[PDB]
Amino acid sequence: MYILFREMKNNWYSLAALLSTIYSRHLDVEARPVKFEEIKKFPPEKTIVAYSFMSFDLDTVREEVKTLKERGYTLIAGGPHVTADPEGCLRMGFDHVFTGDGEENILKFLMGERKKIFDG
Amino acid sequence: MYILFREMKNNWYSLAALLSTIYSRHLDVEARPVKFEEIKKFPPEKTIVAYSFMSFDLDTVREEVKTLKERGYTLIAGGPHVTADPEGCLRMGFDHVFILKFLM
Ligand SMILES: [Pt+2]
Numbered sequence: 001m002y003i004l005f006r007e008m009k010n011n012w013y014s015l016a017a018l019l020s021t022i023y024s025r026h027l028d029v030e031a032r033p034v035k036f037e038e039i040k041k042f043p044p045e046k047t048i049v050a051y052s053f054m055s056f057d058l059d060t061v062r063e064e065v066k067t068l069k070e071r072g073y074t075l076i077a078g079g080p081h082v083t084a085d086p087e088g089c090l091r092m093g094f095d096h097v098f099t100g101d102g103e104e105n106i107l108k109f110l111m112g113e114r115k116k117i118f119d120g
Numbered sequence: 121m122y123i124l125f126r127e128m129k130n131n132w133y134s135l136a137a138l139l140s141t142i143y144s145r146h147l148d149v150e151a152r153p154v155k156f157e158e159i160k161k162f163p164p165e166k167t168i169v170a171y172s173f174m175s176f177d178l179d180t181v182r183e184e185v186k187t188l189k190e191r192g193y194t195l196i197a198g199g200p201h202v203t204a205d206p207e208g209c210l211r212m213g214f215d216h217v218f219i220l221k222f223l224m
Contacts, residue, residue, distance in 0.1 A: 002166035003150040034124035046121035053128040080174035
């Protein structure tokens with residue numbers, strides 16, 4: 001009772017750090033949370049979608065990815081699953097994947113680093 | 121330019137069946153999706169924290185479980201890694217593992 005809470009991981013990046021760095025480094029980037037029905041309010045040419053999921057969700061992720069790729073977005077992903085078999089996620093349609101901690105690696109990506117796999 | 125984050129938000133929470141209640145039913149019980157670096161401001165005596173995690177990041181869970189328990193927070197848990205060896209998650213400092221029956 002009395003104010004229940006939630007914690008999830010979704011730890012593969014640090015949001016606060018990400019927003020902080022985008023702010024401090026004067027990058028041109030807009031980070032927003034999104035439900036799949038949300039977009040395309042955003043042009044795929046200018047838009048990157050980042051994914052985090054468990055070993056589950058793999059069937060609907062595989063579906064959402066193929067759709068979003070058909071609509072010509074850029075897809076990156078991280079989290080507990082992506083850490084193990086990042087190659088599958090790459091063969092799943094993701095453009096760039098991030099194993100382990102991707103807090104620093106994601107910033108390198110936004111700054112132009114094109115690696116298919118960012119180690120963590 | 122635009123980076124959009126898609127969270128899957130899988131739940132052991134039995135949909136809104138168990139959830140939509142704490143909103144609807146509970147005047148004295150409160151629910152909301154949240155994250156860390158928060159939960160600090162909330163009173164430890166009253167607050168419940170429901171963790172969801174994999175075998176990965178099990179060090180961060182333990183580390184946060186050490187801080188929150190020392191501060192007095194009551195922590196619950198559920199998930200794939202909580203399912204397998206809940207006794208381990210219990211020794212980790214979680215008060216109960218997996219819902220509406222408990223909150224009463
Ligand atoms: Pt999880």
